[PDB]
Amino acid sequence: EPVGRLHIFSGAHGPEKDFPLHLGKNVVGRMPDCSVALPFPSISKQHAEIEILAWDKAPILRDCGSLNGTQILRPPKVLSPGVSHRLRDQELILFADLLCQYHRLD
Amino acid sequence: EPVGRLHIFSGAHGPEKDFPLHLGKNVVGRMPDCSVALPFPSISKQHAEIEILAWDKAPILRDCGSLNGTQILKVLSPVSHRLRDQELILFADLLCQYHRL
């Protein structure tokens, strides 16, 4: 039933984990209510949003005004708050210092 | 036999892959004759070098005057950068991670 997966690689925070992604707004943040809950001090309560709409295959990543930022690698830059970045399958992203990878599902 | 490793994250180009690093000079480049052969159009024939002197000493990464560059997540100039464990490296647009063993 999910349309994507976000994989968080193992690091200082702990072991690897996967998070299902659904159509609509997938909020990344430290809060337990978040679609992608990352309860780590470097992560803001509402850190970022991955919006997946049925009418476009590419998710839209936006930073939500986080302290430590959201970084993409195509090209390497910290995202300006609110500006859309369109994600490609298998794209790697950093939330603060946490490395993640987006996967499109069949 | 190997003293470190470089992990290349999955993409369109294929699954995740690990490359062993050995004592001495480990050349990273496009050609199959490189210690770390990364056959991507964006990577130079001789792209970068990871020199490992001892098991217990931090490797030195040097860019070899490649076209698309090498970055630490700090842009590396044709500079001797000392690698930390779990350091993320971009060779051109290709992300990879250095690991101690």
Side-chain angles (χ1 to χ4, degrees), chain B residues 8-68:
Chain B
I8 318 300
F9 294 99
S10 73
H13 68 262
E16 58 196 346
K17 190 176 183 189
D18 291 304
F19 288 82
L21 296 168
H22 297 287
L23 224 66
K25 306 156 99 65
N26 299 268
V27 180
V28 182
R30 180 162 89 233
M31 41 193 179
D33 56 77
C34 300
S35 327
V36 176
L38 307 178
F40 297 76
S42 55
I43 294 161
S44 291
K45 285 196 183 194
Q46 225 119 40
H47 192 103
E49 165 194 288
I50 295 173
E51 190 175 7
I52 301 186
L53 298 169
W55 172 282
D56 62 317
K57 277 195 176 176
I60 292 160
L61 170 61
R62 280 175 265 249
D63 183 271
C64 293
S66 74
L67 179 57
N68 292 304

Side-chain angles (χ1 to χ4, degrees), chain A residues 47-67:
Chain A
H47 193 103
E49 170 189 283
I50 297 157
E51 184 173 41
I52 313 176
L53 304 186
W55 311 136
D56 321 73
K57 228 162 83 165
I60 300 162
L61 173 62
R62 293 167 181 111
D63 184 85
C64 300
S66 70
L67 194 54

Side-chain angles (χ1 to χ4, degrees), chain A:
Chain A
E1 199 215 343
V3 297
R5 166 169 71 89
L6 191 71
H7 181 76
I8 320 302
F9 296 93
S10 55
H13 58 95
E16 64 158 53
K17 187 163 182 197
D18 292 290
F19 293 86
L21 304 169
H22 293 286
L23 291 172
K25 283 161 202 171
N26 299 269
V27 170
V28 182
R30 159 157 64 88
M31 295 290 92
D33 95 314
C34 296
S35 323
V36 177
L38 308 175
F40 311 122
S42 54
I43 302 294
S44 293
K45 287 168 192 171
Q46 177 143 161
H47 193 103
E49 170 189 283
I50 297 157
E51 184 173 41
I52 313 176
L53 304 186
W55 311 136
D56 321 73
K57 228 162 83 165
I60 300 162
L61 173 62
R62 293 167 181 111
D63 184 85
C64 300
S66 70
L67 194 54
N68 291 314
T70 300
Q71 193 184 169
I72 58 163
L73 301 183
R74 218 188 82 267
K77 65 176 261 75
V78 177
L79 254 42
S80 322
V83 65
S84 311
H85 173 70
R86 258 82 177 174
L87 290 181
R88 304 178 169 184
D89 182 46
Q90 302 198 248
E91 191 161 351
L92 294 128
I93 283 92
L94 286 148
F95 298 123
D97 297 332
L98 298 210
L99 185 67
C100 309
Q101 191 166 32
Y102 160 68
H103 298 274
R104 174 171 304 111
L105 294 180
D106 277 38

